[PDB]
Amino acid sequence: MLVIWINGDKGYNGLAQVGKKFEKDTGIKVTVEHPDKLEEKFPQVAATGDGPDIIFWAHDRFGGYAQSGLLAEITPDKAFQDKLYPFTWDAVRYNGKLIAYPIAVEALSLIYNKDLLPNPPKTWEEIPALDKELKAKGKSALMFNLQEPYFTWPLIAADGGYAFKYENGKYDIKDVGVDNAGAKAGLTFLVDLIKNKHMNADTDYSIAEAAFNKGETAMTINGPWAWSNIDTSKVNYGVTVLPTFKGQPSKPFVGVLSAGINAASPNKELAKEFLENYLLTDEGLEAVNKDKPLGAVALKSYEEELAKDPRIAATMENAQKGEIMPNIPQMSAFWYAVRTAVINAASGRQTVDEALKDAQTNAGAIVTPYTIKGEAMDPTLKDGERVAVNIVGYKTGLEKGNVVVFHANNDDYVKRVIGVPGDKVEYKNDTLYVNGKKQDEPYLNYNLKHKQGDYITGTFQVKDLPNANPKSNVIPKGKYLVLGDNREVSKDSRAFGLIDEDQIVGKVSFRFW
Ligand SMILES: OC[C@H]1O[C@H](O[C@H]2[C@H](O)[C@@H](O)[C@@H](O)O[C@@H]2CO)[C@H](O)[C@@H](O)[C@@H]1O
Secondary structure (H helix, E strand, C coil): CEEEECCCCCCHHHHHHHHHHHHHHHCCCEEEECCCCHHHHHHHHHHHCCCCCEEEEEHHHHHHHHHCCCECCCCCCHHHHCCECHHHHHHCEECCEECCEEEEEECCEEEEECCCCCCCCCEHHHHHHHHHHHHHCCCEEECCCCCCHHHHHHHHCCCCCEEEEEECCEEEEEEEECCCHHHHHHHHHHHHHHHCCCCCCCCCHHHHHHHHHCCCEEEEEECHHHHHHHHHHCCCEEEECCCEECCEECCCEEEEEEEEEECCCCCHHHHHHHHHHHHCCHHHHHHHHHHCCCCEECEHHHHHHHCCCHHHHHHHHHHHCCEECCCCCCHHHHHHHHHHHHHHHHCCCCCHHHHHHHHHHHHHCCEEEEECCCCCCCCCCCCCCEEEEEECCCCCCCCCCCEEEEEECCEEEEEEEEECCCCEEEEECCEEEECCEECCCHHHHHHHHCCCCCCCCCCEEHHHCCCCCCCCCECCCCEEEEECCCCCCCCCHHHHCCEEHHHEEEEEECCCC
16 A cells, blocks of 8 residues: 645645556555644654654655654666756755655736726735725735735735755755845835735635635635636636836745655555656646646646646746745744734734844754753753754843753753852852842752652852852852752752853753743
8 A cells, every 4th residue: 555645725636636647556555644734643653653654745844754764765877867957957956965856846827807907906016906996896906815824925025035045055044034124125015915904814715716716715825736626716817927126026935845755654655656657747746637627847848738728837937936945844934933923913012123034043043853861950840851952042031941952061951040150159058149139940849759868959059159259159150950850860060060161062942831
């Protein structure tokens, strides 16, 4: 059996027909599935080893999967490589290696109802007036999915703005383009459409799709996969170039639908045969495309056959003014960061400026999975517990209460920051005094109530500790007091003294409250 995952918006029935052919020829069963959140679930089920043999997604997520060792390197021969456009192979190259088979090029277009709107607008700026005109006639101008930053980026980034800077053949993770003048202008325009009742912040994919396909709204923004359902609605639609904002073309991300092979699959050779000899042929792509259109397919023979379609021409025109999605592992963080900014800006939970400031920071912030070792933070953090570590740069925002990972010599420890540079700190029995006054420690509540002896921390003062000023209990510059929540068993600053700023490598996020 080959198990294949593909997103619910794609032609999974058509893909299944190709599966039936393969079964008929080989005796091997092919099961196509379209679970929710498959792009998040894939690494989860790979960790167990009950994942799909083949996973379809846009190329952006595959860098992250490869970096985690979840994907097999693919080994097409010259003759097969030559069948696909070289730029499609570029999209599935990660650290020198091919990690997926490219299937098709996707970009969003403006889709409009010709009976409601014979002349689609050239500019985003026209849409408010157009909506007023249509509101008078019982309709609206535009509905598209506002929940996913894929759909809102074309406007957001039209006037400037990018994910990661690409230069001299590689992405710079340190150069994020979310908090800049262009994106502020675009996101502000988007928020103002909502503010002014031209769109609704709750509008998602199914709401927008239903509304356009029942003739309630004049325009939507979607990809080629959406065309089949519009064909079935008998709406008279056109697919055209996205409007300009401030005279600048919209900047959709360009995705390449790609198929990766699970590194843990026991059917890698069969997966290769299915993709190369059954799917990526004129016959196989037609089956999927007839179910839900693929876009500009990676296979030259069949792309040439479909290129006559004005809707494909429109797709690629929008793609020419777009931004190829980066495939670096950090893209996941970028998407989540931008998703949050738009929702918060659109709901008013943040101003556009707060939204983009945070998103700029979070898109570039490196987060590393970590597993807790031992009992010294028990029960706050348990042995074996999975946490997230936000890597802190050299001399870059630590506060009391932060739980941190730090080094000394191959040694790493997890402890809580109890005092930072400048803090006066001391313990009398189990009572913590910080800058003269008592500080509560709710994270010790359990261990205080279940203590073996008289006291779990016990009396001490900063002055008496290694690396402190013997003169004062005021923590010196660039130094930190760190203690384990499991005070009865923790080897911490009470044993090895104050630690240095340069020792701290990350801040720990974990399950709490
Ligand atoms: O919204 C963030 C999301 O964008 C892209 O996902 C697209 C996908 O490429 C399209 O094929 C279509 O299915 O819509 C998706 C957006 O809902 C990225 O490929 C994805 O990783 C990212 O989370």
